[model samples]
Target: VYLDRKLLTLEDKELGTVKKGYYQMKKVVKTVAVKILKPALKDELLAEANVMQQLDNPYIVRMIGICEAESWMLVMEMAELGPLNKYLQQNRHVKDKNIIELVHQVSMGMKYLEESNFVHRDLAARNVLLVTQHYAKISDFGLSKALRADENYYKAQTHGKWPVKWYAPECINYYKFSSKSDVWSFGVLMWEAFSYGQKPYRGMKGSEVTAMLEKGERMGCPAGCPREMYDLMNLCWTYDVENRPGFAAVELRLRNYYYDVV
Candidate 1:
């Protein structure tokens, strides 16, 4: 849908902006995020919108409209708290109950993408955005790839800068990605939240990470992290992708865990 440029306003964040403005919708104004699209990367915006269009869920950011006439921008739902990783990097501690709920919220979104036959190649902490103090939504479809309804996995044909540290063994070794691969990446994000945004595999290069995984080594649990959450991360890291839990299973377990702890 085309958005009226006269109805839009912009503010700044990071290198671009997250429009802290409103657009008229259904006789009411709603908060929307509109990012200024760079000319160099204009082509990628279409693909990003394609992936988001297929996705319809509260946990997944919704793309409502775009303006491509005189200027370039994409309008999507607003996430006021911003990137989860950014706030996580601070020394502050979040309430334990809310953390699990937020994690569960992301799991639900990933489950939806898996059911929709899309592979989210990048599921890092920074990719998870917060709509509010309690609501977490997934963003950053830059590396997302759609799979045919009949296909379970998509082979990576092009080499871009990948988050090698979060990749599953099959993805790293054979250049394949599926929902299971995304599962592995989610585990890394979990570790990120639990560790309070410490860099994964600190001081180790990509080759070193590969070697360690080849040796069947896994990172240890962060100090004071919950055992249940750590165990879920291990399940996601299962060497055999076939045996790994999909996002649906991950969400179910987290749902139970969240209620149990609450």
Candidate 2:
């Protein structure tokens, strides 16, 4: 279903802003955001609409329709609890099991995505939505790209802003992204959830982050985070792309973790 601007009243009072953590934006540097997208950056947004059509997973948010208006907007189904990071940060003393389970859901979502050859360029807690305090779904496919069935990686040629802190070394250095790179970001998402939404690379610039990863250094486990969870995070953050476990392995291990926690 295609929606027109004339259908709904997008008034100033009703103008709700979106999240800023999306990497596809060039310079929509705002503590607040609106649905009005930039015409110049249509391909990125266009990719999202095209991309959503191919995806059908419970943990991945669904696109409701397209809004062919003054500014092309994607009308997606509401992620009821909004961004997962804020949800975790706001709900202090929330159970660790709940947090782990939520990240585990992200693994299933990523697993489905990889199985379909879709590379989620940006995978973080901020890009996730909480269906409930315990249920999490992946959102924001703006930076997503689909790979050929025979191809295992997507080589990016454009030069613009990217979420460096959450990116894998191969992505930062060569713009070579694959399911393994997504695994790296998933590890960061795990840290974000366990740390209650603390920013990754809290005090480092892009240069420092790249250097640290080059040196094979990884972030420390979040305080009070379970060792089992940290071990899974390590597997995701593996420096060697070839050594990194596939989403299949990650998902299975997380399911085992969930069973053990229960």
Candidate 3:
């Protein structure tokens, strides 16, 4: 999509510049997110784009179109509320029911990804984006990996900085990840929302947090963490990757957790 001043409808977010010329459509039948690939992204962009192109679901952000001309721009959904992490950070100090509502949307989006045979390798708070006040859609397809059709797919990715505290033990120690790995990260995001954007490590360094987890220690939610939410965070940060519930299982658990409250 040539983002000429003539084409952009609404102002773009962190990923791309908004084309401010035309208000052709007030509300897109769908909001499309367009990402302009950096020169270095040439190698990885194709794979990410291909994966998104193959996917079709309401829950997963849809790949609407692509402008493969200059700069290689990728146009996907322009999720309305921006990244969930940003939202969490903004409302970190405020106690609101919408936080739980955001979690509900994220789980549904994740449920679609898992069901579609996609493993979102980097399922952090930053990776989840909001579509509406109460609805969320997953973004950043760059980190997504396709999983096996039938069997559970577990593999270690190279070691690097993903998200720290929310990371599963195996992912941190072994640089390995799988379907179960995504669940580990989700738990962290849950904790993030519950704690009102408490820094993942409570201001601790990565090495420090790593040392604690290595010594058979699990970090609980930080100060001001909600009781029920904190308890759920504990369940998610189980030391053993295999011991933690999978995304599908997590979805059911969240529903039950909400249902009981209602």
**TM-score of each candidate?**
0.91, 0.89, 0.81
Candidate 2 overall lDDT versus native:
0.81
Supply the TM-score for candidate 2. 0.89
What's the lDDT for all of these models? 0.84, 0.81, 0.68
Best model per TM-score: 1
Backbone atom clashes (below 3 Å) for every candidate: 0, 1, 8
Model 1: colliding residue pairs: none
Model 2 regions lying over 4 Å from their true place:
9-35
Q: Give per-residue CA lDDT, model 2, range 107-189, as digits (tens).
A: 99999999999999999999998878888889888889999888899999974689888888889878899999999999999
Q: How many clashes (backbone atoms < 3 Å, residues ≥3 apart in a chain or on different chains) does model 3 have? A: 8
How well is each residue in 1-262 modelled by candidate 1, as lDDT tens digits?
7788777656554434445667777677777887666455777777787788788998988898887755577888888887887877774578667778888999999999998899989998888888887999998786789997778999987757778898988998899999999999999999887887777899999889989988988888987788999999989889898899999999999999999999
- Best prediction by lDDT: 1
- For 14-68, candidate 3 gives per-residue lDDT tens digits of 5434331122343544455666665566757767778888877656677655566
Minimum summed lDDT over a 10-residue window in model 2 is located at 16-25
